[PDB]
Enzyme design. Structure first.
Site, PDB file in Angstrom:
ATOM      1  N   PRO A   1      -2.458  -2.945   6.062  1.00 12.49           N
ATOM      2  CA  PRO A   1      -2.223  -2.451   4.685  1.00 12.49           C
ATOM      3  C   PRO A   1      -1.157  -1.388   4.662  1.00 12.49           C
ATOM      4  O   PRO A   1      -0.925  -0.714   5.639  1.00 12.49           O
ATOM      5  CB  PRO A   1      -3.584  -1.865   4.273  1.00 12.49           C
ATOM      6  CG  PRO A   1      -4.584  -2.807   4.935  1.00 12.49           C
ATOM      7  CD  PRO A   1      -3.930  -3.049   6.318  1.00 12.49           C
ATOM      8  N   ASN A  97      -0.386   0.226  -8.029  1.00 17.64           N
ATOM      9  CA  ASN A  97      -0.223  -1.208  -8.089  1.00 17.64           C
ATOM     10  C   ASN A  97      -0.861  -1.832  -6.849  1.00 17.64           C
ATOM     11  O   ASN A  97      -0.443  -1.525  -5.717  1.00 17.64           O
ATOM     12  CB  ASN A  97       1.256  -1.561  -8.122  1.00 17.64           C
ATOM     13  CG  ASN A  97       1.891  -1.263  -9.426  1.00 17.64           C
ATOM     14  OD1 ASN A  97       1.249  -1.336 -10.460  1.00 17.64           O
ATOM     15  ND2 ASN A  97       3.185  -0.920  -9.385  1.00 17.64           N
TER      16      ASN A  97
END
Lengths: 114, 114, 114
Positions: A1, A97
């Site tokens: 990530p 986002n």
């Protein structure tokens, strides 16, 4: 990530150990090993939220999976909590986002994760 | 909406009032309330367009809805027009990535918009 | 195409000619003309990868088409190779998000590419 935070808060206001804290909390939250968590903090930015230059943050989390309705609400409580406590940014001046990446669309180590 | 402009134009060439002008004009063009518009301008960047380091801009507009072929053409005329008038960047040295976000994938105020 | 690299490597470690080399190599790899390739390098960033701050890079490639499993593996080999040779970043400390853009979702020259 990959987590990125862009903010108008000054560099001096980013606490020592903030990147490490983001790394650990995101490893726990996504369930991915810390070795795969990348974090990037960009202070001193020229930005506005709702027309105002009070403290704010524009962020993104890209992850291969572990993105969805319930998970993103939990990530948002976690990340807004950290930005409020460590950077003194109000949660309603943060956008995050969330981007669910396909493994074949993430390059790493001369290839992709597919 | 979240609008980001990265440019090699120097900071001193970004006129006072520019973030406000962007906020106001994006609220009108998208129809969104100005309180939900975030803007972010990053000058002095090391970038090239077409191999050339003449003034250029690499931008993105993320929005929950209000993204589409005709809308995006209108936004590009607006935003290229502002970048030409205010930063003296030629419109053919501007790229803008338009991104339609699902409400469940935007964090804000400790939760998401879903 | 638009290629962005964010890195903690210092600006003085980015060699002369690097933006041109990225422009040329991406033109060849994507098959699009160099006039259409934009590149952006952001050094001196506050970032961590896997919990540590040896040289690393967080990147994205946005392209109208020419994105897919095999293409993206080839782009990653090329780009990790360039970041290792030129910025001394280990390929296992590079993440590249590949994004296939619809032509109607890219603004340029007061309109879109649709």
């Amino acid at each position: 990530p990959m987590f990125i935070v862009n903010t108008n808060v000054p560099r001096a206001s980013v606490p020592d150990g903030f990147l490490s804290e983001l790394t650990q909390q995101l490893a726990q939250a996504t369930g991915k090993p810390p070795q795969y968590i990348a974090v990037h903090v960009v202070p001193d930015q020229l930005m506005a939220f709702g027309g105002s230059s009070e403290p704010c943050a524009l962020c993104s989390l890209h992850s291969i999976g572990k993105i969805g309705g319930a998970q993103n609400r939990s990530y948002s409580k976690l990340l807004c909590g950290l930005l409020a406590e460590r950077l003194r940014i109000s949660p309603d001046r943060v956008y995050i986002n969330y981007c669910d990446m396909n493994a074949a669309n993430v390059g790493w180590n001369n290839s992709t994760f597919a």
